[PDB]
C-alpha cells in the first residue's frame, strides 16, 4: 500500500486529467469519470481491508451505489444530447455562449 496506494492515486489523477480535457465524444468523459470511481472504490476497500476496519466496509459499496445512479443520470443526459444533435460530440454543446 505505501506504493500500491500511489499507483491507485495517480490512476485517479490520470483519470482526473482525462475528465478535464475533453475531446469529441462525451461518452469518453463519462467513461473516464467512472475510472475514478473504480480507483476510489479500490483505494477505500484497500485501506479499510488493511486497517481491519470492518465498520467501514459499508462505505466502499455506498460509494458504488451512489456512483452508479450518478452515472445513470449522466448517460440519460448523453442519450438526450444525441437525440437533439445526433451525436454526443461536445462541440455541439455551445449554445449557451
Ligand X SMILES: CCCCCCCCCCCCCCCCCC(=O)OC[C@H](COP(=O)(O)OCCN)OC(=O)CCCCCCCCCCCCCCCCC
C-alpha cell at 20: 478535464
DSSP state of 23: -
Number of chain positions touching another protein (CB under 8 A):
93
Neighbours of 88 (CB within 10 A): 19
Whose Cβ is closer to ligand X: residue 7's or residue 56's?
Answer: 7
The residue to which cell 475528465 is assigned: 19
Please give the residues from 21 up to 80 whose contact with ligand X meets the rule CB under 6 A. Answer: 21, 23-24
Binding to another protein (CB under 8 A): which residues in 34-93? 34-66, 68-85, 87-91, 93
C-alpha to C-alpha distance for 89 and 70, rounded to whole angstroms: 20
90 binds, among another protein, ligand X, none (CB under 5 to 8 A by kind): another protein
Residue with cell 455562449: 97
17 binds ligand X per the rule CB under 6 A: yes
CA distance 62 to 27: 24
> Quick one: 28 or 48, whose CB is closer to ligand X?
28
Residue 8: CB minimum distance to ligand X, A: 16
Amino acid at each position: 500500500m505505501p506504493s500500491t496506494f500511489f499507483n491507485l492515486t495517480m490512476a485517479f489523477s490520470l483519470s482526473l486529467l482525462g475528465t478535464l480535457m475533453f475531446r469529441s465524444h462525451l461518452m469518453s468523459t463519462l467513461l473516464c469519470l467512472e475510472g475514478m470511481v473504480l480507483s476510489l472504490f479500490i483505494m477505500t476497500s484497500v485501506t479499510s481491508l488493511n486497517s481491519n476496519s470492518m465498520s467501514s466496509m459499508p462505505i466502499p459499496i455506498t460509494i458504488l451505489v451512489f456512483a452508479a445512479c450518478e452515472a445513470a443520470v449522466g448517460l440519460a443526459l448523453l442519450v438526450k444530447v444525441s437525440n437533439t444533435y445526433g451525436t454526443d460530440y461536445v462541440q455541439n454543446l455551445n449554445l449557451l455562449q
